[PDB]
């Protein structure tokens, strides 16, 4: 699991953010380094071993101007040192960086059954 990309939340019931498992703390305890630079221990049930966020997933996208909105993943584009998601909203599609794509409590819970590490 060390070095595997995941999407996990650091608060009791916050959003899931992208990161990697840095170490296996043992007994359902994992230490994660998020792509944003934040490190903390997270429980297996709050981790989604899921990368990339699969197509047709309802996600939360972030814009540079403080706005955020829901959308559907319709494309993946890998570039050197970064992944880009194609998010569709109201018929149109826009590219977002990896860190700009997160999951609300509801959006990530739909993936626990298949991708959860609880």
């Amino acid at each position: 699991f060390v070095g595997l990309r995941v999407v996990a939340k650091w608060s009791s019931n916050g959003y899931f953010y992208s990161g990697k498992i840095t170490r296996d703390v043992g007994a359902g305890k994992y230490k994660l380094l998020f792509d944003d630079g934040y490190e903390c221990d997270v429980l297996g049930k709050d981790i989604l071993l899921c990368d990339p966020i699969p197509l047709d997933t309802e996600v939360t996208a972030l814009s540079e101007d403080e706005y955020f909105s829901a959308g559907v993943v319709k494309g993946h584009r890998k570039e050197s040192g970064e992944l880009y998601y194609s998010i569709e909203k109201e018929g149109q599609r826009k590219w977002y960086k990896r860190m700009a794509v997160i999951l609300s409590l509801e959006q990530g819970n739909r993936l626990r059954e298949q991708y959860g590490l609880g």
Partner: protein, 180 residues
């Protein structure tokens, strides 16, 4: 509830994180409510534009040289020029937390002791602040007393809507400083 992290830990975060600062302004008040209830200290909060209670403050921009610089700037916008009569410094820093909001934001909480005169001036001129009528709908004082019925006062004030973990930051500051 919101995850606490050290100040240094917060400053070392990537550029994807934004930083907000808010300050609890308090002053000693020898007044007596009804002549039998000591007010003790006067603590200021503000009714936010979203209908929630919180402390004054705001975002820290690139123009800000430090967290404290951005704080005092925001305070001047939200409270008026009476805020220029003092300054919140690193010595007033209390804690840092990760906000529950979707965007990546870290919140820094401060607490500064003022004189009852400095606090009144803030209240007096709060209506002229840039954010009055827009971002700030009005200032309120935190009641530190509990009325005879055991629910009125602080217990009922803590039942209002608060932004983020302001309620928890409030209670932490009442104990650590012995204000209550």
């Amino acid at each position: 509830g919101a995850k606490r992290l050290e100040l240094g830990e917060a400053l070392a975060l990537g550029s994807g994180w934004r930083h907000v600062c808010h300050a609890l302004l308090y002053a000693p008040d020898p007044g007596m409510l009804f002549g039998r209830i000591p007010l003790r200290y006067a603590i200021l909060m503000q009714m936010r534009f979203d209908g929630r209670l919180g402390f004054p403050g705001g975002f820290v921009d690139t123009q800000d040289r430090s967290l404290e610089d951005g704080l005092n700037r925001e305070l001047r916008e939200e409270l008026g020029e009476a805020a220029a009569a003092f300054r919140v410094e690193r010595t007033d820093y209390r804690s840092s937390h990760l906000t529950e909001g979707p965007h990546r934001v870290v919140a820094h909480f401060y607490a500064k002791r003022l004189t009852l005169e400095e606090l009144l001036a803030v209240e007096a001129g709060a209506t002229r602040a840039k954010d009055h009528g827009l971002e700030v709908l009005g200032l309120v004082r935190v009641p530190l007393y509990t009325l005879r019925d055991g629910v009125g006062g602080l217990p009922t004030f803590l039942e209002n809507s608060f932004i983020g973990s302001a309620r928890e930051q409030l209670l932490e500051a009442l104990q650590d400083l012995g204000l209550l």
